[PDB]
Amino acid sequence: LASYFIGVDVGTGSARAGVFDLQGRMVGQASREITMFKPKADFVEQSSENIWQAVCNAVRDAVNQADINPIQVKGLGFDATCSLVVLDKEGNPLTVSPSGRNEQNVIVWMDHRAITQAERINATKHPVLEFVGGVISPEMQTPKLLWLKQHMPNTWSNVGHLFDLPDFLTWRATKDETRSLCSTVCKWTYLGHEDRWDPSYVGLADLLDNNAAKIGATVKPMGAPLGHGLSQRAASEMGLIPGTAVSVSIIDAHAGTIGILGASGVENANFDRRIALIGGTSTAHMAMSRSAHFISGIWGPYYSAILPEYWLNEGGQSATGALIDHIIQSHPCYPALLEQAKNKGETIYEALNYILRQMAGEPENIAFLTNDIHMLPYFHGNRSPRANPNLTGIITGLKLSTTPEDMALRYLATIQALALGTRHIIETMNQNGYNIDTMMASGGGTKNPIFVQEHANATGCAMLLPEESEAMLLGSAMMGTVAAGVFESLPEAMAAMSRIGKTVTPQTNKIKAYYDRKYRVFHQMYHDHMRYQALMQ
């Protein structure tokens, strides 16, 4: 009878579940919001218990909407943000917060409390650092563990488990404490090529104690089955069958890569020329090679972090969809425009795109609208390729005017700034072993025609959109098929369960030259920022 597979994806704001058939088509889906806590600037927290319930509720819902018998679900995969879950000796939520509330036991990925620690770690120039592009980010795990040790010794003395969020999800579902290569290698300095933690690697030697206690010391590749399927409790909690295969966990951006990067063309995907652009709240820029490439300001090279025998170079932008939405929803004209959008059966993006079109006189003139309006998009710092979490945003060409036209121009400027940041990342990869001329893109941005076309225009790269845009849900379900033994490797699941839905190419030379000039201003703004800093010193 028909088999189905479930992908679960816990993002920044919400946990999603998706039910997929063997073709990779989505037959059921659901979402559940998750609580966020912001004690003070730079602090961002969540709750593991709250996350797990959102997951279980979302899954029961997606199954019920697919209208299938739970006996039909053969596998699950779990993916999550690279956030830090903290549990005590008995395994319950243990506080990580200035609030002191144990409910707040998750340090979200975007949290920047540990900038100072990252600086300290970086000062050591220890060997494991070359695999994070030479500069460790406060957003990664070990700087946050160094932060916990120093500020909250109370919590530190009572810790039993330290889980990357996806490994937490997987543990709660199977009891297996086995950790993934993805999360450990990318965010914990585990050596994928030497298959071991580096003892020499900072003031966290105690984590190495009891061999395999707090941080885990059994590590496997994605697609390998965990424990013996869903525990009876977890199964009960999600409305599924005990023993259902569960894959080793994976980080969200990385799930999205499995979900789209392997799509055949129309002819094997060619990684030398194809980058994964995994969008959402933030964006990951994923490229893989058989050879190691060390690249300043880009994480990796990470051996076997996604695909066996591939080195992953991972860049990113910390605020992409989050920046666009901030710029949109921050504007005084937002509520009124949204109201007319609904009246016309439109999204706010469609309403803004309409304004752009009208202002431009012709669609091909839209990009020029921001000739005198520029943005440096480093609102939450820059991850790649500058690797500096202290950078901030700049907008120019501001006027007293508060109209839907102003709002639309600033929205466009935001889109182009993000596209130019993407160009910077791509150019950096092409300077370090790649020949990227194509982006496989996922995320909600890909439903916005102007987002997509200007990314193609600014970068000079074709934009390929998947048939199924929910790339992270799909990727995690694909892992499920591999743990259930329905496909023998990720590569073949990727091939059978994902395909191209749309190809959008760069437009004219005039438009390209415009972006070349915008790109000069983009780079100049960074140097101007550094000069202001110098002058103030």
Could you give a short description of this structure?
The chain is an alpha/beta fold. The protein contains 16 helices and 21 strands.
Set out the fold topology.
Elements: E1 4-10, E2 14-21, E3 26-33, E4 45-46, H1 48-66, E5 73-80, E6 84-88, E7 106-107, H2 115-124, H3 141-151, H4 153-156, E8 159-164, H5 165-174, E9 179-180, H6 181-188, E10 219-220, H7 232-238, E11 245-246, E12 250-251, H8 252-260, E13 274-278, E14 283-289, E15 299-303, E16 311-317, H9 321-329, H10 334-343, H11 348-360, E17 375-376, E18 394-395, H12 404-430, E19 438-442, H13 449-459, E20 462-466, H14 471-483, H15 490-497, E21 500-504, H16 509-536
PDB class: transferase
Keywords: glycerol kinase, Yersinia pseudotuberculosis, structure genomics, 11200d1, Kinase, Structural Genomics, PSI-2, Protein Structure Initiative, New York SGX Research Center for Structural Genomics, nysgxrc, transferase
Assembly: monomeric
